[PDB]
Design a binder for these strands. Structure first.
Ligand SMILES: [Mg+2]
Ligand SMILES: [Mg+2]
Ligand SMILES: [Mg+2]
Ligand SMILES: [Mg+2]
Ligand SMILES: [Mg+2]
Ligand SMILES: [Mg+2]
Ligand SMILES: [Mg+2]
Ligand SMILES: [Mg+2]
Ligand SMILES: [Mg+2]
Ligand SMILES: [Mg+2]
Ligand SMILES: [Mg+2]
Ligand SMILES: [Mg+2]
Ligand SMILES: [Mg+2]
Ligand SMILES: [Mg+2]
Ligand SMILES: [Mg+2]
Lengths: 243, 98, 239, 77, 124
RNA sequence: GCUAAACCUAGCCCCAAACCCACUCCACCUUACUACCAGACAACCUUAGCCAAACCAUUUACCCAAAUAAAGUAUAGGCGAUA
RNA sequence: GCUACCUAAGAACAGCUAAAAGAGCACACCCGUCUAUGUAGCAAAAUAGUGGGAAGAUUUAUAGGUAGAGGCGACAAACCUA
RNA sequence: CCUCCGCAUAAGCCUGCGUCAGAUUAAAACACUGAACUGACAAUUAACAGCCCAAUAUCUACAAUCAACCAACAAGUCAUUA
RNA sequence: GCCUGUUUACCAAAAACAUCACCUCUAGCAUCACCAGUAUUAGAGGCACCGCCUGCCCAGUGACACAUGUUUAACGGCCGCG
RNA sequence: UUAAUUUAUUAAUGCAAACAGUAUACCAAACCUGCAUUAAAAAUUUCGGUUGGGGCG
């Protein structure tokens, strides 16, 4: 026999089934977006057509990504668009020798930051590209809120983004009373986003966490049928009496 | 970040399709790394009076190490963003009157 | 591989604790050290190597009293339980130590040297030049680690201003801080090298398997190395 | 001083918590509802639990610093 | 080789296995430090047997009994037979209150009375 | 003529269509087929190799996006068996 | 679970000479130098003595660990379910 | 006539020479009927070994070998308190 | 061949491997075996007791000092003609 | 193995980024990253032809 749907559509089928179909639209769209990240370990081509030497004929060129590995240390900390590259390297840079395997490792600098939106210092083993992006984005909060989910490549970054979005949406007192001018200035500095509350709670959550949250929201202990029975009875008696 | 290029060249598996890769494409080659490069100095605007590295008023392009260590965490310098420069120059113009 | 160590006692006591042999088995189970396995059952004694130690609500010097000298199978030298105060702790015995002896564990360094006996212990800052010492420490309040076998002893060389160079039995010099407590005299159970084995039964009882029977060709490290004395290693931390 | 406590024999320290409890104003989504231990990021913090009814087979005695027969000086029996 | 298709009873293990297996018997106590059994009188199932003196009902039915249609006894029928008359009686006069319903047999929780239904405290 | 020869049905393979299911009560993570008690540690990783090039060290469709002609074209390849 | 090694708790060794003994003969026991029987046999490795040990480098009942780019090895390239 | 055997404990599938009918056919290296069988009848009842121990702190150096002479070395198999 | 013993389970059970005596090299030392040990110790190697003794060499290899050297009980070698 | 590609994993090295004092100069500590070298492992392989049977001639 044969299958009705291909093997690469079962995830979409399970999402369109029942328990995974009650998810909100924005979360499903953000999960099914799937956008390519920024080139990090390779220089992308300028134009779509490149004139190669030796022959005067134009050819279309494309920039392919590099299959990099993400260890759990990357998800725990805040890394850039790099990671572990499990590739192969020849001997003396020639294909007429031996094909050896070489795995590069990024550099880790255990530094300390200070988030202005959360007002709490965290110890994160930051690298160099992340520090460069933070310096170019003029702060850490801007680097966290501007970069999308395909740029952080870490769970802590998405958690920080979701926390900042909730803090900016709920208008909850960040610091403390007796000086609201600082909180007002902080809220005015980060005003070019302002994601609503019903959509900021589903930013960065995985599939299992989303299913757990949807089950907890749709829990509801079974109401006893006695209340429904007496309600139907009083409705029927009112309908037969008022007529 | 180590920038490497792919060997054997990608055979271009269409424009809207997924690029099919082979086991021979795993071989890379190092061309240039982010390190071993003469670093550049960033521009930071200070807010207080220090020694001979800065002064309250104008800006000075200092090193990245000093800026990340004893300038930004201690609140002695701000990034060179196009937002705070406006208020900085406004305060500088209001300070130096006619 | 459920390999758990038998060193599960965080409180010092006097009752000998039963020990489990290993035979060269770590946590994985593979033999990594050859020549160990199959021996007579032994019981471990908690030996207190730190000489000077104040009791509860104590600070000044205290007297002790040697009771009885026994034997420890875990090492070459013999041990001797010395009672004193309201507690009893096992310490390493010295030469010419019998029942009814009196030893002192002082710490106040004096202006001049102290003509102590070969049983009591005093810091190196109060000992004359040229005295056979043993059980020397490396850091103040760490514990005696060097020169602890049978009959081994060290002799004081010279003093500078806050250090004390101790001549080790390996003919190598080594300095240490002046505020280090070290015993005086030689360890008991002498003439240990003259102990004739006789048969392989003694080695099997001690727990030592015979060597490998493979004929290994001697490389370039089997020749005699006439090397000079290595330099003196310093443990004093200087800023 | 040479300690007599081995790190391999004593109780090992628990692993540190995840990076979700360090966020001020953000509740974690753990597995406290499914009532089983999960592989999916799931490890919260459980509060202490005590028994309301005393059991002779599961009775714990209080420390010595609050016994009714505890005194400041020590005797010799 | 040994057997595999047969189930694991209590006549296969050595001296260390005869005891903790059993035949599914319900325990009515525990053990102590002296190889004794502490049987609790509150753990043995007490059989409640009513009196059968003046009981005029035989276990077999006669063939002269007429048949009738079969229908399940759902909760709606029991409700409309028990609580509906009382509710109609208290509403037809003018004293029904939808705030309190504990006087009709409804219980908001099952931790008050002994014989609970959802957790099932009774055996059978 | 003794030994022994044939008597069709459980169905078996692939198409077109359709997306297919999982507690009557008890037992099932310890010695599964066990009713009842105090350290909560457990996944996130280039597949490799044979053969072929008369050996073999570079290389050798298998990579899961519907046909065909382009086209086995430019190309990659101890510029060679091949892709 | 047979066999190499290790670990924790046990058991075994009549009698005589016992020189104090990793002493001797010798029961049970550990291994098998030789003769004779068969090689589709009792047995995909047996039958009696001539054999060495038998108070210790001995044997064994129970439980656990060391596995192939390796385990182990008083080193036979010996053993890791015929 | 042999007993170099047997009875128990330890390990091991658990009903494997008790009765009844068939014993025409089927497995005894041939027979009776039964240690190479079909169905029905029910054995074994614990006192035997297990199923074990409420916590907080603290305490436990003068072996066994008739253990009393002597003598050692491979330095050792057993206990409590508020 | 010092001895007892063990090794090719299943054609060799031995002069074969091991054993105390001897010699060489390495290590200044706290928690998972080594070792809850301290240069009379531990690990890595060669022969294998007691009696007489081990005479020479760094041209070549390795090791140690980088001072042109030391090491052979480290790999190995100790004439021919008239 | 002193036959061939190479050090893929150590300890020593030199360079570059990472910290901190220092009057136009020196010092480079504990822990991560990349390049090239030295002793151990190794990821792979072959061992040509006639030879009045084969090697030797
Ligand atoms: Mg030896
Ligand atoms: Mg040898
Ligand atoms: Mg081929
Ligand atoms: Mg052996
Ligand atoms: Mg004997
Ligand atoms: Mg004998
Ligand atoms: Mg050999
Ligand atoms: Mg011999
Ligand atoms: Mg043989
Ligand atoms: Mg044998
Ligand atoms: Mg033989
Ligand atoms: Mg020999
Ligand atoms: Mg010689
Ligand atoms: Mg030929
Ligand atoms: Mg020829």
């Amino acid at each position: 026999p044969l299958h009705k749907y291909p093997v690469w559509l079962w995830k979409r089928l399970q999402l369109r089934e029942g328990i995974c179909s009650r998810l909100p639209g924005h979360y499903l769209r953000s999960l099914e977006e799937e956008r390519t990240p920024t080139p990090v370990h390779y220089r992308p081509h300028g134009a779509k057509f490149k004139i190669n030497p030796k022959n005067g004929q134009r050819e279309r060129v494309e920039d392919v990504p590099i299959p990099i590995y993400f260890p759990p240390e990357s998800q725990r900390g805040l890394w850039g668009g790099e990671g572990w590259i499990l590739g192969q390297i020849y001997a003396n840079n020639d294909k007429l020798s031996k094909r050896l395997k070489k795995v590069w490792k990024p550099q880790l600098f255990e530094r300390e930051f200070y988030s202005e939106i959360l007002d709490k210092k965290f110890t994160v083993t930051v690298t160099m590209r992340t520090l460069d992006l933070i310096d170019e984005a003029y702060g850490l909060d801007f680097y966290i809120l501007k970069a999308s989910g395909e740029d952080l490549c870490s769970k802590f970054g998405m958690d920080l983004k979701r926390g900042m979005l909730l803090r900016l949406a709920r208008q909850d007192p960040q610091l403390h009373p007796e000086d609201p001018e600082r909180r007002a200035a902080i809220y005015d500095k980060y005003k070019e986003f302002a994601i609503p509350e019903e959509e900021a709670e589903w930013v960065g959550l995985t599939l299992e966490e989303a299913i757990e949250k949807q089950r907890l929201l749709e829990e509801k202990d079974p109401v006893p049928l006695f209340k429904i029975y007496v309600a139907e009875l009083i409705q029927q008696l009112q309908q037969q009496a008022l007529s | 970040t180590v920038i490497v290029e792919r060997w054997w060249k990608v055979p271009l598996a269409g424009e809207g399709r997924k690029p099919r890769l082979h086991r021979r494409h795993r071989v890379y080659k190092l061309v240039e790394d982010t390190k071993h490069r003469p670093k550049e100095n960033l521009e930071l605007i200070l807010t207080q009076s220090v020694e001979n590295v800065g002064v309250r008023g104008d800006l000075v392009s200092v090193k990245k190490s000093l800026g990340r260590n004893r300038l930004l965490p201690q609140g002695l310098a701000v990034y060179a963003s196009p937002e705070n420069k406006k208020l900085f120059e406004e305060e500088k113009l209001l300070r130096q009157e006619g | 591989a459920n390999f758990v160590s038998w060193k599960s006692r965080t409180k010092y006591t006097i009752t000998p604790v039963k020990m489990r042999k290993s035979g060269g088995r770590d946590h994985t189970g593979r033999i990594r050290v050859h020549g160990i396995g199959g021996g007579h059952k032994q019981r471990y004694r908690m030996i207190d190597f730190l000489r000077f130690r104040p009791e509860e609500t104590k600070s000044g010097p205290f007297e002790e009293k040697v009771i009885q000298v026994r034997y420890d199978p875990c090492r070459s030298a013999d041990i001797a339980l010395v009672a004193g105060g309201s507690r009893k702790r096992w310490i390493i015995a010295t030469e010419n130590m019998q029942a009814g002896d009196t030893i002192l564990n002082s710490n106040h360094i004096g202006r001049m040297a102290v003509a102590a006996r070969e049983g009591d212990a005093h810091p190196l800052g109060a000992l004359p030049v040229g005295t056979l010492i043993n059980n020397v420490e490396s850091e103040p309040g760490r514990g005696a680690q060097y020169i602890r076998a049978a009959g081994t002893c060290g002799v004081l060389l010279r003093k500078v201003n806050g250090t004390a160079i101790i001549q080790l039995p390996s003919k190598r010099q080594m300095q240490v801080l002046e505020t280090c407590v070290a015993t005086v005299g030689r360890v008991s159970n002498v003439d240990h090298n003259k102990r004739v084995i006789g048969k392989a039964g003694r080695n099997r009882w001690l727990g030592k398997r015979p060597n490998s029977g493979r004929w290994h060709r001697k490389g370039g490290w089997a020749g005699r190395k006439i090397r000079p004395l290595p330099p003196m290693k310093s443990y004093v931390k200087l800023p | 001083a040479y300690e007599w406590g081995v790190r391999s024999t004593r109780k090992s320290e628990p692993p540190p918590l995840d990076r979700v409890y360090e966020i001020p104003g953000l509740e974690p989504i753990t597995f406290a509802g499914k009532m089983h231990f999960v592989p999916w990021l799931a490890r919260p913090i459980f509060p202490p639990w005590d028994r309301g009814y005393k059991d002779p087979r599961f009775y714990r005695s209080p420390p010595l610093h609050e016994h009714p027969l505890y005194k400041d000086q020590a005797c010799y029996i | 080789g040994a057997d595999r298709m047969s189930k694991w009873t209590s006549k296969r293990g050595p001296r260390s296995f005869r005891g903790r297996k059993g035949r599914g018997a319900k325990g009515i106590g525990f053990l102590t430090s002296g190889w004794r059994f502490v049987q609790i009188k509150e753990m043995v199932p007490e059989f409640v047997v009513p009196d059968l003196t003046g009981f005029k009902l035989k276990p077999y039915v006669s063939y002269l009994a007429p048949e009738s249609e079969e229908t399940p006894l759902t909760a709606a029928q029991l409700f409309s037979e028990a609580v509906a008359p009382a509710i109609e009686k208290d509403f037809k006069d003018g004293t029904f209150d939808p705030d309190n319903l504990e006087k009709y047999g409804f219980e908001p929780t099952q931790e008050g009375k002994l014989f609970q239904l959802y957790p099932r405290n009774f055996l059978r």
